[PDB]
């Protein structure tokens, strides 16, 4: 009785074979830099967990981004720091340049390399078929890297992908929701952002893995190739699942929860209905058809599975025919 357990089908045991220091972030000792090295220039915004600023590193006169954290648990901050340090230098992973103590907030301030980003809302409207494939491949490099390093991002979305379109450079940012994957571990389902939440989160299945990120990526791909951002545009977390079910169908949703011996919230009884699985072609029209190909639709179909175990891994995704036309570096 109770939920049937689940494991990642790749990188399952990466952390158990790393030194304890690698994943035991609660024991991490932070190496603090010199707070005087960074001059704040302008506020970029304020999120749930921090205030973000453009700044200058006065030791090299280079632009950097500074995130001054709102007060939060030392283990959560240590988790983000340890993950950033573990992944530093990896393909398309944002570089943590420094960590300093902000004397006003009395909290840590994380210092990142700057990316000359184009607002995704504006950028996505301009992406060609080739660009979408190219940047999707770049995101996959970052995801296969972090997964291979025992880490799931858990907040993949356009806002967390910074793109310098001029230099064709991409960085996956905002690792504050990321976690180490340990087989059999139950995780918080209150992660990711609504439109990018995987079915596992929406049905409260806690034993999830790297494959969560692949659902989120599929949501991004659908928004890009169909020019509809976000693709699954739910009004709340319940409606989010209904919107998904209107596309993937309710019978396969029941197959998913039945496999894992999960029950839907009874509040779905009055809102879920009965829906057939749709063919992806229904979302194609004259305004997005130039971004769609049989390869794109098959790739999307293989990312957006209810069953997290059935989704392409990041490495499998990079083997897909969709990327045959992308020039390899
Ligand atoms: O949000 C205002 C702009 O500044 C960029 N920006 C926002 N949050 C950012 C964060 Br958080 C990081 Br780390 C980096 Br690097 C950049 Br660049 C960020 C995106 C926008 O182009």
Pair 33, 165 in one domain:
no
CA distances from 112 to 19, 152, 162 (A): 26, 20, 12
Task: Please name every residue paired with 69 in a beta bridge, in sequence order, or none if there are none.
Answer: 50
Q: Which residue, of 69, 96, 114, is where some domain finishes?
A: 114
CATH number of the domain where residue 96 is located: 3.30.200.20
Q: For residues 156 and 72, what is the distance between their CA atoms, to the nearest angstrom?
A: 22
User: Do 317 and 299 touch, CB atoms closer than 8 A?
Assistant: yes
Cβ–Cβ contacts within 10 Å for residue 229, how many? 17
Omega prior to 115 cis, within 30 of 0: no
User: Do 303 and 317 touch, CB atoms closer than 8 A?
Assistant: yes
Q: Which residue, of 96, 114, 132, is where some domain finishes?
A: 114
Q: What is the DSSP string of 231-245?
A: SS--SSHHHHHHHHH
Cβ–Cβ contacts within 10 Å for residue 198, how many? 28
Q: For residues 243 and 232, what is the distance between their CA atoms, to the nearest angstrom?
A: 6
What resolution in angstroms does the PDB record give?
Answer: 1.2
Q: Which residue, of 92, 114, 136, is where some domain finishes?
A: 114
Question: For residue 251, how many C-alpha atoms fall within 13 Å in the half-sphere facing its CB?
Answer: 4
Task: Please name every residue paired with 169 in a beta bridge, in sequence order, or none if there are none.
Answer: 164
Orientation of helix 211-225 relative to helix 129-148, angle to 10°: 170
Pair 122, 254 in one domain:
yes
Pair 50, 141 in one domain:
no
Pocket residue to mutate for ligand 1, from 54, 55, 92, 115, most atoms within 8 A of Cβ: 115
- 229 part of a folded domain: yes
Pair 153, 100 in one domain:
no
Domain range enclosing 78: 24-114
Method of elucidation: X-ray
Q: Give the nearest ligand 1 atom to 117 CA.
A: 21
List the one residue out of 148, 149, 184, 178 whose CA is nearest residue 76: 178
Could you tell me the two tokens for 249? 């169908």
Residue whose tokens read 């990466």 = 14
Residues at the annotated binding site for ATP?
A: 44-52, 67
Ligand 1, atom 7, lies closest to the CA of 44
Instruction: State the pairing for strand pair 179-180/38-46.
Output: unpaired
Pocket residue to mutate for ligand 1, from 38, 43, 44, 69, most atoms within 8 A of Cβ: 44
Element spanning 163, H or E? strand 161-164
């Amino acid at each position: 009785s109770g939920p049937v357990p689940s494991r990642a089908r790749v990188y399952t045991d990466v952390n158990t074979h790393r030194p304890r220091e690698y994943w035991d972030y609660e024991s991490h000792v932070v190496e603090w830099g010199n707070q005087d090295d960074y001059q704040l220039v302008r506020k970029l915004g304020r999120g749930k967990y921090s205030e973000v600023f453009e700044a200058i590193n006065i030791t090299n006169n280079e632009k950097v981004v500074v995130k001054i954290l709102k007060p939060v648990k030392k283990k959560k901050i240590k988790r983000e720091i340890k993950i950033l340090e573990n992944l530093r230098g990896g393909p398309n992973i944002i570089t943590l340049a420094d960590i300093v103590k902000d004397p006003v907030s009395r909290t840590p301030a994380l210092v990142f390399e700057h990316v000359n980003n184009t607002d995704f809302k504006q950028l996505y409207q301009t992406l060609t078929d080739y660009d979408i494939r190219f940047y999707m491949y770049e995101i996959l490099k970052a995801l296969d890297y972090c997964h291979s390093m025992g880490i799931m991002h858990r907040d993949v979305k356009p806002h967390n992908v910074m793109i310098d379109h001029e230099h064709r450079k991409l960085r996956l940012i905002d690792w504050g929701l990321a976690e180490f994957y340990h087989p059999g571990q139950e995780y918080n389902v209150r992660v990711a952002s609504r439109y990018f939440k995987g079915p596992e989160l929406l049905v409260d299945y806690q034993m999830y893995d790297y494959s969560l990120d692949m659902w989120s990526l599929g949501c991004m791909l659908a928004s890009m190739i169909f020019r509809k951002e976000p693709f699954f545009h739910g009004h709340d977390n319940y409606d989010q699942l209904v919107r998904i079910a209107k596309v993937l169908g309710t019978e396969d949703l029941y197959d998913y929860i039945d496999k894992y011996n999960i029950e839907l919230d009874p509040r779905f009884n009055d809102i879920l209905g009965r829906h057939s699985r749709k063919r992806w072609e229904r979302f194609v029209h004259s305004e997005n058809q130039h971004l769609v190909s049989p390869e794109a639709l098959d790739f999307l179909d293989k990312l957006l599975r209810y069953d997290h175990q059935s989704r392409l891994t990041a490495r499998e995704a990079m083997e897909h025919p969709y990327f045959y036309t992308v020039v390899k570096d």
